[PDB]
Amino acid sequence: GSNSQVWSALQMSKALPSPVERIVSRDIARGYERIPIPCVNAVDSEPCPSNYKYVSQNCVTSPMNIDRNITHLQYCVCIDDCSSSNCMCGQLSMRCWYDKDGRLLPEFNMAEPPLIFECNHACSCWRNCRNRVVQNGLRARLQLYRTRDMGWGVRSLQDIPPGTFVCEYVGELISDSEADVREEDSYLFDLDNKDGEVYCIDARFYGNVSRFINHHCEPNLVPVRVFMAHQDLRFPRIAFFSTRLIEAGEQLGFDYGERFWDIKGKLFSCRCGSPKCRHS
Amino acid sequence: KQTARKST
Ligand SMILES: Nc1ncnc2c1ncn2[C@@H]1O[C@H](CSCC[C@H](N)C(=O)O)[C@@H](O)[C@H]1O
Ligand SMILES: [Zn+2]
Ligand SMILES: [Zn+2]
Ligand SMILES: [Zn+2]
Ligand SMILES: [Zn+2]
């Protein structure tokens, strides 16, 4: 049923000529996002994937001890909408990269993104200031769907302008060591690429819509590291922004990276279909 | 590493 495989996932975590398109869920998020995320299948008889628990925000199993001391937060004292060079939070980000529509400026370096520090609850500014985008949550109309060749994937139902926040990679925050012994590694996302005390998000047991975004070698999304309610640099949050105009109906994709394909390429090849595919 | 990891 709707819950049978969700429960099973929760308990495993605790222990450790085509068909007419069918709507298999009106909302995979069960009302937890600002808009529904429907699930459809125009390919076969498979029900909506349910062997995970949908969560809209990161969770933990074993404790992570994120620094949440409010007095440690850098904040701004702006009397405007945080559009000026006087904003501390923009300075921490190099500049505020968001235009008035909430979209990344053309100058934003998508090949080597900076860290973004959004305004927070210690700032003097108001909740509607310019430097608040990822913290406003999923806005775009997305859909989980059955692909022909690549299991489930995510599409946009509407045009998404370049530089728009699409969704966050959400899941269970775990250590590098715990990640190294997870039986299913397909949903792991490293928070930092260096050696030492580094952390991961595992979206296998707990995740959001982003867990179904397939890899693409010429991707329409780029992940960016973002700080909002805390500034513990061990725990950036992963926000996907569009790299170009994404047309209504288009599948979302991002570049999983070499730390994925170094392992998985030994088992199967990329089928993204790009003329510039780097993993087939 | 022992397991696959997506990355930024
Ligand atoms: N470009 C690509 N080529 C081949 N397989 C892909 C792919 N992108 C994602 N996948 C598959 O999807 C897994 C990542 S999870 C992404 C959602 C997945 N399609 C699902 O139905 O659950 C990968 O390990 C691989 O099995
Ligand atoms: Zn400010
Ligand atoms: Zn601020
Ligand atoms: Zn502000
Ligand atoms: Zn490819």
Numbering used by the authors:
A (entry chain A): 949 to 964, 972 to 1235
B (entry chain P): 4 to 11
Publication excerpt:
SET domain methyltransferases deposit methyl marks on specific histone tail lysine residues and play a major role in epigenetic regulation of gene transcription. HKMTs catalyze the transfer of a methyl group from the co-factor S-adenosyl-L-methionine (SAM) to a substrate lysine and, with the exception of DOT1L, are all organized around a canonical SET domain. Methylation of H3K9 in humans relies mostly on members of the Suv39 family, namely EHMT1/GLP, EHMT2/G9a, SUV39H1, SUV39H2, SETDB1 and SETDB2, as well as then non-Suv39 enzymes PRDM2 and ASH1L. Here we report the high-resolution crystal structures of the methyltransferase domains of GLP, G9a, SUV39H2 and PRDM2, and propose a structural mechanism for substrate recognition.
The H3K9 peptide lies in a groove formed by the I-SET and Post-SET domains, as previously observed in other HKMTs (for review), and makes extensive contact with the enzyme through both backbone and side-chain interactions. Our structures single-out residue R-1 of H3 (the methylated lysine is used as reference position 0 for peptide residue numbering throughout the text) as the major contributor to the interaction after the substrate lysine itself, with four direct hydrogen-bonds between the arginine guanidinium group and GLP. Intriguingly, our structures of GLP in complex with mono- or di-methylated susbtrate peptides reveal that residue H3K4 is making 2 hydrogen-bonds with the D1131 and D1145 side-chains of the I-SET domain, which suggests that H3K4 methylation may lower binding affinity, and reduce H3K9 methylation efficiency. We tested this hypothesis, and observed a mild decrease of 43% in affinity of GLP for a H3K9 peptide trimethylated at lysine 4, and similar reduction in enzymatic efficiency, while Kcat was unaffected. Several aromatic residues line the GLP channel occupied by the substrate lysine leading to the catalytic site and contribute to methylation state specificity as previously noted for several other HKMTs. Second, the hydroxyl group of GLP's Y1124 (Y1067 in G9a) hydrogen-bonds to the methyl-accepting nitrogen, thereby inhibiting an orientation of the dimethyl-amine that would favor transfer of a methyl from SAM, as was previously shown for SETD7 (for review). Unlike I-SET, Post-SET is absent from the PRDM2 structure, which lacks co-crystallized SAM or SAH. It is partially folded in the structures of G9a and SUV39H2 in complex with SAH and SAM respectively, and fully ordered in the ternary complexes of GLP with SAH and H3K9 peptide. Post-SET is fully structured only when bound to the substrate peptide, or to a small molecule inhibitor, but the density is incomplete otherwise. (3) A more rigid conformation in which the I-SET domain closes onto the substrate peptide.
